[PDB]
């Protein structure tokens, strides 16, 4: 678009390091805009992202690098009867009444286990030592992957993250970095080696694991869903569902450390943890720009006439800094009004795991502050945030008096 000629000089590295400056310009100049290096239109404001995600004239589409990573039928990329079946498949263990029955007994012992490894050290790097392991161990146990170590689940989500977000396209519209998908293919090959024997077992001997229920629930007697039909949703889980509660926890902690008086309020009154996490997710949204919708008819949005069949990436992390909606959105503020945010998306493809994820993060933070109420951020170490499609802190060094 003519007035956006500067977008041709935006690089993938710039977006990964810090997308907020480019997107601040997009929100003012062009809430719906084609970004050449991403090969796609992007929605940057709250109004546009919410309209696209909820519109009857759009449906889900996987991003280009997302499709190369996950294939079909990834739950994020399908619609109609297949999407309705996949949602019916994943929803039982995520239903709020079901989560409330067992979430505490799942997450709290796991948080205690990881805490005991470091709570008397006086220093820790909380992303690797706590946030990521609690997130992956909780979900891994729910899924039936009790025997897959947390380091391995963390390695898989990192590789899948890099493949899914390997979005850069060249001057011809072709992927600029095709070898960046190789580590995704490698992760998937390893996942298959580990998970295929578990599926073999669950087909004949169902148990209470969620993946066993994905095979069996709603199927006629003696039948299971084909493994090829469920694997792309397994992969979707082994990326975002494993990665995001850890990132959300960690971003919430960074934000609280940036407002020391608010950190103190939350440590003294842990009933404020849920509000702290909601602000954390708005402040640095873990899924920042990983999903998309495609138009099914011509539409006009934010002045742009789009033809049918036009993908639009939903940059919810930008929408969550919309200054039309928020005052000083780049500042973390526990006491912001409880406005809707888009960190779980919207519409029929909104996050299916919200209630689970919010309890994972809550319980992990409750236990952290009970164990180390005098946590302080190691402030000469910097908190680097990284990522355009998924965003979170790369490390979180903390210190405390033992
Ligand atoms: C803080 C943690 C999490 C955040 C911020 C988050 C955010 C999101 C977002 C932004 C999307 C895309 C929504 C859209 O395109 O409108 C999504 C999709 C999804 N999430 Fe979550 N997620 C989190 C954790 C989880 C967990 C732990 C699970 C599973 C237990 C999960 C299951 C799903 C599923 C199944 C979808 C696909 C929904 C669909 O396409 O129908 N999420 N999530
Ligand atoms: C829940 O996991 C995901 C959500 C959106 C995009 C990729 C994912 O793996």
Author numbering: 6 to 407
How is this structure described in the published paper?
GcoA belongs to the CYP255A family of cytochrome P450 enzymes. Our recent characterization of a two-component P450 enzyme system consisting of a reductase, GcoB, and a P450 oxidase, GcoA, demonstrated that it demethylates diverse aromatic compounds, including guaiacol (which can be derived from coniferyl alcohol and represents the aromatic functionality of G-lignin that must undergo demethylation), guaethol, anisole (methoxybenzene), 2-methylanisole, and 3-methoxycatechol (3MC) with similar or greater efficiency than other O-aryl-demethylases described in the literature. However, GcoAB shows poor reactivity toward syringol, which can be derived from sinapyl alcohol via high-temperature reactions and represents the aromatic functionality of S-lignin that must undergo O-demethylation for further catabolism via ring-opening dioxygenases. In the present study, we hypothesized that substitution of GcoA-F169, which has the closest interaction with the bound substrate, may relax the specificity of the enzyme sufficiently to permit the O-demethylation of S-lignin type substrates.
The closest contact is with GcoA-F169, which forms a hydrophobic interaction with the C6 carbon on the aromatic ring of guaiacol. Each protein variant also crystallized successfully with guaiacol and the structures showed that the orientation of the bound ligand remained consistent with that of the WT enzyme. Furthermore, comparison of the surrounding active site architecture confirmed no significant deviation from the WT. Thus, the GcoA-F169A mutant, which showed enhanced turnover on guaiacol and syringol, is closer to the CYP255A consensus protein than the WT. It is interesting that although none of the GcoA homologs in our analyses exhibits a histidine at position 169, the GcoA-F169H mutant was stable and showed the highest specific activity on guaiacol.
